[PDB]
Amino acid sequence: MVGLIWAQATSGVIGRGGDIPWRLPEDQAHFREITMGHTIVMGRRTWDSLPAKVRPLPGRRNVVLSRQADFMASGAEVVGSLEEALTSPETWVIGGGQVYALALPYATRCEVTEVDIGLPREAGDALAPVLDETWRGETGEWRFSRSGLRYRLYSYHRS
């Protein structure tokens, strides 16, 4: 299986300035459940944002995707192509904008946390990918995060 998991504002923004303009610990915990024990695949420009001590994410096969035939990533594989990263029954694309649209033809699951924030698509913002009509998904109800923003999960599937 190949699933994508992201959190987006309602405008569709996932990131800005090479980082994320929110922090919901309820999404930290959902994201950790989904991914734990499986392969996680992330863009190089996502691996760096991650401080050296939080990294690699524990108990998961960390794969960074880069063009650099000699990128370092202590504690992960660096692979130059997506398919190289497929040989677990569960592989989770965890960001960001470039790698999302790249893995979208491989994906049968999308796990979306929708964050109820007015965040206009301005900058060189990274955005969530486009889910066309082949994607069936169950919308959630707004839960209140302790940070103060609302949110709700989304699970999309196509066979």
Ligand X SMILES: CS(=O)(=O)Nc1ccc(-c2nc(N)nc(N)c2C#CC2CC2)cc1
- Work out what residue 68 binds among ligand X, a copy of itself, ligand NDP, none; the CB cut-off runs from 5 to 8 Å by kind: ligand NDP
Q: Is 127 left (phi over 0), alpha (psi -120 to 50) or beta?
A: beta
Comparing CB distances to ligand NDP, the nearer of 98 and 155 is 98
CA-to-CA dists, residue 70 to 43, 78, 79, 139, angstroms: 15, 8, 10, 42
Write the single-letter amino acid at 136. Answer: R
**Whole-number Å distance between alpha carbons of 137 and 155:** 5
Nearest to 19 by CA among 27, 7, 35: 7
Binding of ligand NDP by 7 (CB under 6 A): yes
Q: In the window 65-94, what residues touch ligand NDP (CB under 6 A)?
A: 65-68, 71, 80-81, 94
Q: Does residue 108 touch ligand NDP according to CB under 6 A?
A: no
**Which positions from 110 to 129 touch ligand NDP by CB under 6 A, shown as an x/- string?**
----------------x---
Name which of 106, 98, 150, 149 is nearest 128 in CA terms.
98
CB 48 within 8 A of CB 40: no
Q: How far is residue 2's CA from residue 88's CA, in Å, rounded to a whole number?
A: 9
Query: 89-118 mask for a copy of itself (x: CB under 8 A)?
Result: xx----------------------------
Quick one: which of 20, 65, 126, 128 contacts ligand X (CB under 6 A)?
20
Closer residue to a copy of itself in complex, CB, 122/138: 138
Residue 95 touching ligand NDP (CB under 6 A): yes
For binding to a copy of itself (CB under 8 A), which residues are involved? 1, 29-30, 32-34, 36-37, 89-90, 136, 138-141, 153, 155, 157-159
For binding to Co ion (CB under 5 A), which residues are involved? 108, 159
